[PDB]
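User: what does the whole thing look like in 3D?
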Amino acid sequence: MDERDALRISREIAGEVRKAIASMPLRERVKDVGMGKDGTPTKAADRVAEDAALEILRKERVTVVTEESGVLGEGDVFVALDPLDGTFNATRGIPVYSVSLCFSYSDKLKDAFFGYVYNLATGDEYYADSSGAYRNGERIEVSDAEELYCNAIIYYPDRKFPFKRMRIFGSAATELCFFADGSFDCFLDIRPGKMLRIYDAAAGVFIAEKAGGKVTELDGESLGNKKFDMQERLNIVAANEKLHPKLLELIK
Amino acid sequence: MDERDALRISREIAGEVRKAIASMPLRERVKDVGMGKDGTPTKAADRVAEDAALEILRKERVTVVTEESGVLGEGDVFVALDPLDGTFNATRGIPVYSVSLCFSYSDKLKDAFFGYVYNLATGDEYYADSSGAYRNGERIEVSDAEELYCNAIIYYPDRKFPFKRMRIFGSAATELCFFADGSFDCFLDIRPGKMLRIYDAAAGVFIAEKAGGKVTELDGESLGNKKFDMQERLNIVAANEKLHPKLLELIK
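Assistant: Here's the predicted 3D structure for the full assembly of 504 residues, as structure tokens:
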């Protein structure tokens, strides 16, 4: 498969997931039926979103991994997917929630060849291939702010920080993209309990990297060895190359 | 002028401000249009919403107050107005920004008789009058959460906290409405460097109270004496009756 292929497939998933969730009234969304591993009842929203995406994924030569369904199938192409990042927002009419799709030629992030994040509330489409990172088809770049007094997304501020603004919108996939288009100057998920799962990170990280951002673990390590497995976990430090080392000295 | 009149005028203003902003590509929204008085440069998106809101409002017998224009007019009915709360989001296409209006029979918040907050991004309509609080024509009420492990909006997290989630969306008028309809369990602005202005707090406070919430300054003092035209920056603790006292004790 090529990017060209992943982009077609991803737009078809977006299209269906929107269809499925949208129809679903608020009280629909907020009901539970399932069994999240780490601790959660599969709401109505997540299963209806998962159902749309998988049936479209099951028809290609890929291996699909999600929090819910976990792992199964077979394909030389791996896809770390979250049918609905921001379920809390979706069940309350807060317009920040997305489907995230990252395609890889191996089981590691290092060989990902396509990233896709679609805001299922507004229709904003983010993606990236070897040819650039895009928002609604327009190419995008990260900002180039070099001082700590910047616009940050941070999970979770623990003490006083030097930032000009701090935001927390509840959909890391989408927020990684807010970073990628330069809307915010950095993205941080520095929580000690490391709760960020590879599904919500992969595409956002891939798209941010294509946009020019430097995206590492807390330690500054490279996310390449991060795996498309059920128990992978991530802390993330993300900014342009000038600001990134300053952030590491700050949270040091 | 009564609550029926206030509802009619607010609806007229929100229609024109949405149309004016909706037709503005982000590139134009984010432009500077020269510095204001007690503030920074003005963004093009602020002046366009401000021109549209004032051209309707100033035709009424009121004293209008806005951050950007100060006190205008001499009616005995005061209106606290933000034509665009959440300009940062609006200029980056983040769908959380609104027009906010609080009508009072004096310049003090305690004489408020109408509050209105319209999300210019989503067309959601929040309002409150003597009959209660509404979202898109349907009565709302705050949640009955009583534990500290709750869903909180908070400016800004500064230590370890016991909450289930912390969020920061960048439009307090809207965020107070997210609290008003039970989407979040509390709204906290505890910043020692106070920034929240009466133009962005007043309507959301009026609506949240009509929905059954308790809303005060950090020490538990009433906000009824805050004035639209003799302004103080605020800190706020807002929650239902059971949860509020616990939050007061916590944030110490």
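In plain terms: Chain A touches chain B at residues 88, 92-96, 121-122, 124, 151, 156-160, 165-170, 178, 181, 183 (CB under 8 Å). Helices of chain A lie at 3-23, 26-29, 44-57, 87-90, 172-180, 198-210, 243-250.
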